[PDB]
């Protein structure tokens, strides 16, 4: 019945190892017992084969394989060498023909004449043999080919040096990865069109990229440099010391750093360290520098573009666009030139010369153009920008300042900068030879291969990540077997093998044990873990079948045996010591400098004890070695490790110390040290990365510079953009769907507390992980506008879990230490912990309350400016268990808090003697403690210092004469205690039923102030009572006799002294005794206001007051005076009193902001009241202008305003007063109820108290205890403040 019909089936394919993607191959040798590169140096067919090939690639890492034979042949009648590699079952494809082994053709020497163009080793050897001559470049050429040193300080170490080094044969070329000065001496040369791209030079001597010196007419031209530079005794962007040389049209774009405290002369500059010739010039030159220096003495001259400029050396049409940053203002620091003045006996006729020089620097602790300003300055032209020229000047609290050595210009720089219109060149990248890829884009058949589907090119390019080292036919087969619905149809980055979230690298060690998982990382940043089981014992390349996809997976390693290498180099790797001289040789360091700032004292022995496993994993992830029995490549690997053992161990220690955190049980040291291909960029190798990090030098390995080191050295080996972007990428792949702030808080061992404000709207704003409004500490530590970004890595890598507590809030983030509150009453365990945790929560709540009050009070969209981040350190005065003492322990100390934090965070505290001080963008608790109750009030004080100029005021700066401590102590800082009889506003503290006797303040600021108008009502009612009491006492002291009036009353007065600027307009209050005629004038209450009378009871001063002083105004001591400084600033006592009176009368924004916050500067300038302060033409706001603006024309003088306020209070109270005043007024034998019902009783009692305190004068050290008037006023104030809830009403009206 059935008729047999055949079925034609597809044919099965043979699988072989193949190298599809190839960039360029390199041949090595063992000719002189050391492994050296050979580049066409093979001139004859070599007799024996001790060579080996290193086939680089751009898809994955290189594949070192030995050489089977060498023969001379011709591919196209040109003499080439048939270098044939070798592998177990390798295969090579050429025009659809399978060759048994990999063969490339190495041509002999090229005919390129008139210059050595090949490679860096050839170039430097030629220039060493023949210093004269012309040496162009033929290709973009890297500088790590040269072994870089025996003890030398430069690549070319001859005086004469590359007299004509062009770098444009037909197109411009570049030199990569420089590590030392290029020439060490330059004399009569004509360097031209060179372009160094990534230079990392570090020399204890004078350090610069293209040369150390320039003796004769060396015409540098079009030489563009870049990269980081670190020096110790001089620095130069291109040349450290030029004489008689014209560095024209060059540039420099990188970082420069000399932060050592050496007491020696150095001339560091971003372009040239010193010009010292009559014919020296710098023309059409740019300098994008990021310099962080430390001058410390008037001889070290940081210099921006150029350092010392001497003997009529010019700076023409130059330009600098960076961020210079000195530490101390002592040395001569300049934005453009550090010193224009001669070092010999200097006549002005031989000074430096500038012309058409701009400066877009954010220079700190230095001038803006020239560091040294003198009478005969010779700039003759210079421009600038509106940027930060901060110079840290020291008051009792530090603060910013300007320098005023500048010619100012607006923001037309985007046009003024492009006078030299050249913007672009085209430096070529490193060249490649070929690509033996099988999939050719041209279509001989509509299918590229035999079985190649045009719809699945992305599937093939994803399979090429799953299956490296496999023939192209098997690649297309497994591409065709990919399921249609499978998610391998999207772009794929490289995959990793976790083994149940462990990220294994040693595949030879762990192939037998099934790799239980396989993490696929996609371009969408989405991840996907697959299950894989070790399928087939293909020992060359381990094969893992995916669970149910029918595909396979082969890890990118050949399961090579590293036992020989490990046992060979372990002995020489374990005989390395941190304090040895070898470490001081691998680090380009002197003998005076100490290795404390590395903070790798313990991790060094940790990674030296555990060196074998990490070394095996590093070799496994380094490269690919294809051998069975010979050791021609193992010897090369052991030589590479042995020659760089110190650098290897230092890089390994650094990367293990600062990257110990984990993403959900997957350590990040594995993903950082190993698996460089996690973000793409599989070209890189782990061992070379670790080596080049180790050789980076002392400055790059420094603990403070972890983020910068990553960004400028560790990046472009991983493919990332920055350190925090890399951490975010790792968090996106491992542990997804969790905000990175939550990951940081669950990884960091610091006790982080974040208090979101109680207002619903701001809480909703903060609870969103989108930055610029978030409260999360990680969203602010990693964001720009945060100076110390190197805080993140130490915070993640914290050892002991009880050493640091972190208080974060709106507009602040504060760091502390458990060991600060340690004492004999609080030992190390289970008591200090609970105390610090509870007090940290309480202090965070108090700080949140403070900024909640200020967020309510601010109205003119300044509340949007309350989202800043100002750090708050603690004392560093760590305690001990035995005594209740403290040790400062700045740095250099073995306290684990200092070593694990506060040291890696590169912040050094000045360590003043008492109190707390503010820096203007930071805040430190020297004597007070952040977790105490007084910590809140001092925090308020110094935050009013920090946020005075911009946030608390309407953005208008402080007034002309008012100092930083005019605002804090008397106006905006919360009172020290509850019972303080001072006119302040309670913001932070909250009293609980125990201070309710002698309270005299607001107990609940979170419930009292709910708007600006609530603050205005509170102040208006408090001043209603204050004015009532002042009226009552004034109407008594006016009805009084001669001597006792003279005793009770004193006259305040304004005396003007010369401010250390040019002006003498700012007033200073002075309390003096008053004359007989003035006393005889005092016959009523109005005359007390007229004659400037003050009360001696409270303000015990009898002499002049002081500017910038901690003065406060008492509630009960009357100041009958209305003192107006028609000349200028009013003073520090009457200033506070008038500010509070204006806050009582007018609102906070309409009054007391105009009075104290320079708001009418524009109108003062328009009306002619202009002055000159520190060379700046600034308006002067006389108090009469303030009165005219706050109140339109109602009041003509402050005396009239004061008398009108008193008249309003009088007309209110003379008829209506609350009966509820029930003060007892006596401790023993008291009157049970005064029961004040009409103001006659209050007036009679106040008059009796004043009359009985005029006689029996106190006049002693104790005027507050023994005075009856103060007791009566305090009793009345407390009774009224108790009657009303706080200050909602004092005289009910309407009926």
Numbering used by the authors: 907 to 2201
List sentences from the manuscript:
Many invasive bacteria block the initial mucosal host response during colonization by cleaving host immunoglobulin A1 (IgA1) via a bacterially encoded IgA1 protease (IgA1P). Here, we used cryo-EM to characterize the metallo-IgA1P of a more distantly related family member from Gemella haemolysans, an emerging opportunistic pathogen implicated in meningitis, endocarditis, and more recently bacteremia in the elderly. Third, all M26 metallo-IgA1Ps comprise the M26 region itself that is responsible for IgA1 cleavage, which corresponds to G. haemolysans IgA1P residues 907-2201.
A cryo-EM 3D reconstruction of this metallo-IgA1P resulted in a 3.2 Å resolution map that readily afforded a near-atomic-resolution model that includes the active site. Specifically, residues comprising the conserved metalloprotease signature HEMTH motif (residues 1847-1851) and the downstream E1871 are structurally perfectly aligned with those within S. pneumoniae IgA1P. The most striking difference between the two substrate-free IgA1Ps is that the G. haemolysans IgA1P NTD2 gating domain is shifted to a more open position by ~6 Å relative to that of S. pneumoniae IgA1P. The large shift of the G. haemolysans IgA1P NTD2 can be viewed as a partially open conformation existing along the conformational continuum between the substrate-free and substrate-bound states. Interestingly, both metallo-IgA1Ps comprise an extended structure within their active site that are residues 1296-1308 in G. haemolysans IgA1P (corresponding to residues 1054-1063 in S. pneumoniae IgA1P), which would occlude substrate entry. For example, the gating mechanism could subscribe to an inherent opening/closing (opening/closing of the “gate”). Specifically, our findings reveal that despite the substrate-free G. haemolysans IgA1P structure showing a more open active site relative to that of the S. pneumoniae IgA1P, substrate binding is still necessary to further open the active site to facilitate access to the hinge region of the shared IgA1 substrate.
